[PDB]
């Protein structure tokens, strides 16, 4: 190495500050001349963002640091000229001049007074000169100022203007991914007070650039997947006007406002719907928005689209009523039956040739052979010989379930379901009529038509003096009205559960039926339920039939709300002994369908992890784990893996009753995708019998082994299970379970929908019609009472995987697309890659793939939605010669 001679920066820019103490007095001209010459030299040497190790920015603190210590503080006669060249130049190196804890000592140079327009020599720099110093100021000093002293000195008045100018400057030089770096200072500055920060930044972003908005939007929704309660309420309301003011999408609003509907306020949802109705220019965007507004993302929306011009545009809601439903039925009849699907395959158990080398209970499973594969108008004429012959011999519960299964066979029908039901309805049986009415209620599910709100099912209900034909008269009607919030059926059904009659099971299912309809107002149902529970469960210590049925209605009435005030009210309203306090952990968690509550998650287990479980609060920890299954359905692909690891290392590895009996019931709630991790963890826990524990529990685990639909090639594995089920695992308790698990795999056929997450991460209800299956399958030995009936159609919230197509006004084009893998790309570079599966290209409207993203070509540009909706319009345009 060579030193001296060329080392002029460590000499002149070190001797001028060294003689500055002697030039401070009796030298007015030099005090300004040398100051300006040093400032200009350092600025010119710091203008380029390639020579980070400046010869002046680092060689000045060796001996001029003590000079600056005696220069700014030890002068006491600061003028209006030297300060602009002094502070502006001492604020640049001071971030790196001192040791690591320098953040607390920025007020000795820069926070005293900002000289003029220092951004002039900081515009050519990105994250080196002073925007790093701005972030340092906002990180701690501004944080400690705004934690409790928002009204304060200069550290809050003009600092906001400097932050705004820095943020604007960020997207000026290169407009790179540093725009995503803009929120880093924006979020750090006034974290909880993000509302006014976003309000100030919205006008800047509107006039910044059109293209630089969509990426920021994506980043916003990426940071919307999790936030503090106040932070969520602020950001999810602040991101609303972005696609409207800056961008002109006008179509991605309503779909992306589900995060701001319930969490912010239902009045925000109302005003968003009103704004969408205001912008009725496209007359197409509106159709796409309204298509998925009853059974896809939300419901009960047919109360706002009855304005004065219901002709073709505002009348579109009417087509969303049932015309779109009939169109979907016709699409299922045309693009599925005519292509690959025959009327009655019914042969998954008829592949028993390989196996080689009489109870009527298996006949129940035979019904599952018919109903599951005969979905979507799989009507069978004289192919129901088994059901026709066995509906009148034995298995009253099973015969009722088989009668009800015909409704699931005729899924999403309004044409003649009741006409077909009438063939077998008039029989005067204790269970045929109830099952027929449940099938009828299944048939018109989602249609919400004037089929039978109080005409047919109420006629059977008003005679509520029968064991069945009175109970089996409320599940179907509740299912057909699950998405509505009409209070007429509410007032009709309230006396049913308020009857205080001897019908225990009827009142329990009434609680389930009524809860799954309303999720918001009507506290009268809450009061009636809580008072019936007080007057019933208090003076008894019987089994948990009420426990799994009464509080579930309350949870459904208080589902999806992060305010936690409802939870506090419910918990303090029903304070009682621990057995009476079985609902303490039900309502508290029921308001936490999807959110980030890691604190609540750890406090769930903090009260009682095991406590040695001396046969005292088994059901308490059971239900606590069941409610702990939440936050894994849509954890933004982060919390699920940690949760499954915790379950493996904590529950299954060691436990007493939770780990060894119902710890696997979580996987059903976890996901229905199907990964080899769980596809081997479940088999490792199921292939071994281990008769030591309550064997039936393991049987229940097998019932959820094939909870994942979308058949794949490992199905033979389950056939192997049948082999070990031939001799072992006596059929009297597992023949129906093995059969239903086997044919559930292909029960979807090619039409599947049992995940409850549409578009990006909006779950979209579903839970209401899913939770009861998991919360009723706690004990599988109770199937005798009505196990056939309950399962027979609990999962009636099946929406199908058929989505992408055309849906044009003429609907002439069939399909011109290209499928590929998921398409989420982080902003590592502005040009982005996301799908690593361009190997496929199909032009059909068949299966859309589970982890699959479909794009287009041939110069279409997708001017309808371009984001999400699963009902793409495929607008055509050719503005590219």
């Amino acid at each position: 190495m060579e030193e001296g001679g060329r080392d002029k920066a460590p000499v002149q820019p070190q001797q001028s500050p060294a003689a500055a103490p002697g030039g401070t007095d009796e030298k007015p001209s030099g005090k300004e001349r040398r100051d300006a010459g040093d400032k200009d030299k350092e600025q010119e040497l710091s203008e380029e963002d390639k020579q980070l190790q400046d010869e002046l920015e680092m060689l000045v603190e060796r001996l001029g640091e003590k000079d600056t210590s005696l220069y700014r503080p030890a002068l006491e006669e600061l003028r209006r000229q030297i300060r602009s060249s002094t502070t502006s130049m001492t604020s640049v190196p001071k971030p790196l001049k001192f040791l690591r804890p320098h953040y607390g000592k920025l007020k000795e140079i820069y926070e005293n007074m900002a000289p003029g327009e220092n951004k002039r020599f900081a515009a050519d720099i990105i994250s080196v000169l002073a925007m790093t110093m701005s972030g340092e100021r906002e990180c701690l000093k501004y944080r400690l100022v705004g934690s409790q002293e928002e009204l304060a000195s200069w550290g809050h008045e003009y600092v906001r203007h400097l932050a705004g100018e820095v943020a604007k400057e960020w997207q000026e030089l290169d407009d790179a991914e540093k725009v995503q770096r803009e929120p880093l200072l924006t979020l750090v500055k006034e974290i909880v007070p993000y509302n006014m920060a976003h309000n100030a930044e919205h006008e800047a972003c509107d006039l910044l650039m059109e293209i630089e908005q969509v990426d920021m939007l994506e980043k916003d929704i990426d940071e919307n997947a999790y936030a503090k309660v106040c932070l969520y309420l602020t950001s999810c309301v602040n991101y609303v006007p972005e696609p409207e003011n800056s961008a002109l999408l006008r179509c991605a609003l309503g779909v992306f406002r589900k995060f701001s509907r319930f969490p912010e306020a239902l009045r925000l949802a109302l005003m968003l719907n009103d704004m969408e109705l205001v912008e009725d220019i496209f007359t197409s965007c509106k159709d796409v928005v309204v298509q998925k507004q009853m059974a896809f993302m939300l419901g009960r929306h047919g109360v706002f689209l009855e304005l004065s011009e219901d002709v073709e545009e505002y009348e579109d809601l009417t087509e969303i009523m049932s015309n779109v439903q009939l169109n979907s039925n016709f699409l299922a009849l045309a693009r599925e039956l005519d292509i690959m699907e025959p009327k009655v395959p019914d042969d998954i158990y008829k592949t028993h040739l390989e196996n080689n080398r009489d109870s009527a209970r298996m006949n129940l499973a035979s019904s599952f052979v018919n109903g599951f594969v005969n979905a979507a108008f799989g009507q069978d004429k004289l192919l129901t010989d088994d059901g026709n012959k066995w509906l009148y011999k034995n298995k009253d519960h099973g015969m009722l379930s088989a009668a009800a299964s015909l409704g699931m066979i005729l899924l999403w029908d309004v044409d003649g379901g009741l006409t077909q039901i009438d063939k077998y309805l008039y029989s005067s049986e204790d269970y045929i009529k109830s099952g027929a009415l449940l099938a009828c209620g299944i048939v018109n599910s989602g249609v919400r038509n004037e089929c039978d709100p109080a005409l047919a099912l109420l006629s059977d209900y008003v005679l509520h003096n029968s064991n069945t034909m009175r109970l089996g008269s409320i599940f179907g009607l509740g299912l057909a009205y699950a998405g509505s919030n009409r209070e007429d059926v509410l007032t009709l059904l309230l006396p049913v559960m308020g009857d205080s009659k001897s019908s225990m099971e009827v009142a329990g299912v009434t609680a389930l039926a009524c809860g799954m309809i309303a999720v918001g107002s009507c506290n009268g149902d809450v009061t009636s339920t809580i008072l019936q529970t007080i007057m019933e469960k208090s003076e008894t210590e019987l089994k948990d039939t009420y426990a799994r049925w009464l509080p579930l209605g309350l949870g459904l009435n208080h589902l999806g709300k992060g305010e936690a005030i409802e939870a506090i009210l419910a918990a303090l309203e029903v304070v009682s002994e621990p057995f009476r306090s079985f609902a303490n952990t039900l309502v508290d968690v029921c308001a936490y369908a999807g959110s980030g509550n890691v604190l609540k998650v750890q406090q769930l287990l903090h009260i009682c992890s095991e406590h040695f479980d001396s046969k005292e609060k088994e059901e308490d920890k059971d239900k606590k784990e069941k409610k702990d299954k939440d936050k894994k359905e849509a954890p933004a692909d982060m919390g699920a893996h940690q949760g499954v690891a915790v379950l493996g290392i904590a529950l299954i590895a060691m436990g007493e009753e939770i780990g060894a009996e119902m710890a696997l019931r979580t996987f059903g709630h976890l996901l229905r995708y199907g990964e080899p991790t769980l596809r081997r963890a479940v088999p490792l826990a199921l292939a071994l019998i281990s008769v030591s524990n309550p064997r039936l529990n393991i049987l229940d685990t097998l019932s959820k082994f094939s909870h994942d639909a979308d058949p794949e090639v490992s199905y033979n594995s389950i056939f192997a299970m049948g082999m070990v089920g031939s001799g072992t695992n006596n059929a009297r308790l597992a023949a129906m379970l093995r059969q239903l698990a086997q044919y559930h795999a292909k029960d979807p056929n090619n039409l599947f929908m049992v995940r409850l997450a549409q578009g990006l991460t909006h779950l979209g209800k579903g839970t209401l019609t899913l939770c009861p299956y998991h919360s009723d399958r706690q004990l599988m030995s109770q199937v005798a009472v009505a196990g056939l009936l309950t399962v027979l159609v609990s999962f009636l919230d099946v929406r199908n995987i058929i989505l992408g197509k055309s849906h044009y006004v003429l609907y002439g084009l069939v399909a011109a697309m290209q499928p590929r893998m998921l398409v989420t790309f982080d902003e590592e570079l502005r040009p982005l890659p996301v799908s690593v599966r361009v190997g496929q290209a199909v032009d059909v409207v068949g299966q859309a793939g589970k982890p699959k993203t479909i794009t287009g070509f041939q110069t279409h540009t997708t001017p309808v939605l371009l984001a999400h909706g699963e009902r793409a319009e495929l607008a055509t345009e050719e503005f590219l010669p």
Partner: protein, 384 residues
């Protein structure tokens, strides 16, 4: 243990920070949960009590045995070292996932029950054909060709180093490469350069040893070779002088000429069988390409064919420049006179002449090289 691969922000973004904080909180809570039971209901050390119990269960001697067949319900037939086999059971602490036919297992001394499973001990072959270190310097030592170097780079290096160009256009890289030309022109040299640059495991084998002295040994050797190449990693298989199996015949071969055909059929299957090939690249080289079977070189097995022509006089000057770079060469000599010493001299003659001249100067205990040394060296090396 691969907790979370989604760290694609790779910066100071609030998303990555929040994810890391939530991961830390989850880990802390699970640690508290897994420690509470050891603090409240230990019932055993569980760190060495279970280990002590296990060691007490298994005897101090344990013998090796060969599996032959396994039943699902935890027992199997194990052949003892002598040969007599039994019907012992299987314990629970044996992690029944390495249980495979043919693996040596650790049996108890008394009841011959399976207590453990044993890792194998490599093979003699693997050392024989595994290249360890990069031989010598990369393409900067070749010179002259500069044309097919890009072709080789396109075939082997580019699919591994930048697997993004192909995915944009959606194609599979070309599969096979073969190099042909007159002898002594730089084929093995290019192979050495590729071996130096590459990062995958490099396997080399000559064609003259594909022929054995018993019946059915050749196909066995071929199958084992591709099994080894498959079971490691992305790898490169290099076969040199294939035609040596079709040109020379040896009396040590037990069969006649048909076992050569059987070996050929086996090799053809291995190149393009109906099993999933995986990720293996094949490089072949010969100087008599008009004799081997055209069914071995069809597209789909070998896709690229590269010819190495005789050097030109510009390349001759470049080669002389390369091979006397560090020689203390006197000023009297001139390379132009040596260029047309022979009409059609190849690459190897240059190095031969240079080394022989160096040795001749070494005899007289000198340092410089004069003209008469080169003049006698060319006669010594060329005219016999």
């Amino acid at each position: 243990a691969s907790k979370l691969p989604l760290v694609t922000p790779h910066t100071q973004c609030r998303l990555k920070l929040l994810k890391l904080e939530r991961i830390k909180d989850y880990l802390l809570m699970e640690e508290e949960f897994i420690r509470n039971q050891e603090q409240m209901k230990p019932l055993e050390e569980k760190q060495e009590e279970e280990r002590s119990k296990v060691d007490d269960l298994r005897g101090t001697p344990m013998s090796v045995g060969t599996l032959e067949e396994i039943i699902d319900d935890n027992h199997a037939i194990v052949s003892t070292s002598v040969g007599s086999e039994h019907y012992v059971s299987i314990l629970s602490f044996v992690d029944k996932d390495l249980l495979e036919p043919g693996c040596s297992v650790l049996l108890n001394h008394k009841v011959h029950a399976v207590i453990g499973v044993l890792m194998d001990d490599t093979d003699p072959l693997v050392t024989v054909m595994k290249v360890e270190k990069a031989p010598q310097e990369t393409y900067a030592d070749i010179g002259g060709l500069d044309n097919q170097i890009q072709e080789i780079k396109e075939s082997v290096e580019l699919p591994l180093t930048h697997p993004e160009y192909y995915e944009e256009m959606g194609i599979k890289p070309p599969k096979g490469v073969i190099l042909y030309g007159p002898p002594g022109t730089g084929k093995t040299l290019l192979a050495k350069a590729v071996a130096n640059q590459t990062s995958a495991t490099f396997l080399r084998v000559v064609g003259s040893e594909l022929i054995q002295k018993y019946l059915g040994d050749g196909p066995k050797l071929v199958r084992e070779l591709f099994r080894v190449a498959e079971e490691h990693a992305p790898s490169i298989v290099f076969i040199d002088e294939i035609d040596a199996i079709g040109t020379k015949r040896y009396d040590s071969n037990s069969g006649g000429e048909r076992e050569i055909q059987r070996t050929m059929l086996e090799l053809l299957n291995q190149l393009d069988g109906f099993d999933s090939r995986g990720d293996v690249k094949v490089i072949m080289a010969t100087n008599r390409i008009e004799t081997l079977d055209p069914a071995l070189i069809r597209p789909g097995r070998i896709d690229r064919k590269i010819e190495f022509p005789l050097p030109d006089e510009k390349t001759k000057k470049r080669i002389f420049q390369i091979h006397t770079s560090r020689m203390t060469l006197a000023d009297d000599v001139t390379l132009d006179d040596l260029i047309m010493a022979k009409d059609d001299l190849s690459g190897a003659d240059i190095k031969a002449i240079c080394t022989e001249a160096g040795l001749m100067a070494l005899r007289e205990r000198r340092m410089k090289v004069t003209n008469e040394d080169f003049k006698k060296s060319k006669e010594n090396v060329l005219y016999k």
